[PDB]
Design a protein around this ligand. Sequence first.
Ligand SMILES: Nc1ncnc2c1ncn2[C@@H]1O[C@H](COP(=O)(O)OP(=O)(O)OP(=O)(O)OP(=O)(O)OP(=O)(O)OC[C@H]2O[C@@H](n3cnc4c(N)ncnc43)[C@H](O)[C@@H]2O)[C@@H](O)[C@H]1O
Ligand SMILES: [Mg+2]
Ligand SMILES: [Zn+2]
Length: 214
Amino acid sequence: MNLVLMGLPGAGKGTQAEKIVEKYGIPHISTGDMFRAAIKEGTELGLKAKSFMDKGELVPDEVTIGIVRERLSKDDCKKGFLLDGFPRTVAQAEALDNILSELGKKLDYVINIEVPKEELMERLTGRRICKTCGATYHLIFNPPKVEGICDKDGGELYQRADDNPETVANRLDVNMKQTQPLLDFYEEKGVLRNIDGQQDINKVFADIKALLGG
Ligand SMILES: Nc1ncnc2c1ncn2[C@@H]1O[C@H](COP(=O)(O)OP(=O)(O)OP(=O)(O)OP(=O)(O)OP(=O)(O)OC[C@H]2O[C@@H](n3cnc4c(N)ncnc43)[C@H](O)[C@@H]2O)[C@@H](O)[C@H]1O
Ligand SMILES: [Mg+2]
Ligand SMILES: [Zn+2]
């Protein structure tokens, strides 16, 4: 299965991706995670991405396409993959078609997880992440059992740099501008599948399972 997860910032893509890889054993390819890892390596690519990410802007198309092309070329993507947060512009979507054509592959589904803007703001500002294992919580919808600490080790929880209200506002504006173009692109292809992301995490996943069952 060759899959894209699409959704506005905070819509639950990582949450659902983790459940998809656990069930189906395909690799999770998240451009955001890749940029954050590059930032940690301290690479020139990483540091250039950081300037956009800190402002809630999209990293420019050409560099983003390049890391995706390289990642999809690996042996672990031969039997399927899960792209998460790529593509983010129509130019990226067109590039992906070319990347896949070169590999002799086709997208099966673009799974678009729909949540309203006001809810997404709170998804992000209420997000807390474990410093020591990267487990994700939400102060309202998925709280840790003990305030301020991770359930699975005892690690301190932190707030992603870009989850501050100012940056979240810009993230939402930037990606909302790109949304109708992307939706139309994939509707034309007949591969867009919309999922109601305003449900219990497991009910979202149940809807995705029903789709992937076909
Ligand atoms: N292709 C590209 N081109 C250019 N630039 C790019 C790029 N890709 C990345 N970038 C750059 O990198 C930056 C970051 O990328 P971005 O795509 O923002 O990073 P991300 O971590 O992949 O995605 P989000 O942080 O938006 O969250 P999510 O949808 O994964 O939600 P989550 O499951 O964590 O859940 C969020 C919260 O909600 C909670 N939650 C999840 N599901 C539910 C539910 N069903 N009900 C209630 N709460 C829930 C969680 O507990 C959590 O607290 C971009 O701004 C840009 O600069
Ligand atoms: Mg994510
Ligand atoms: Zn932890």
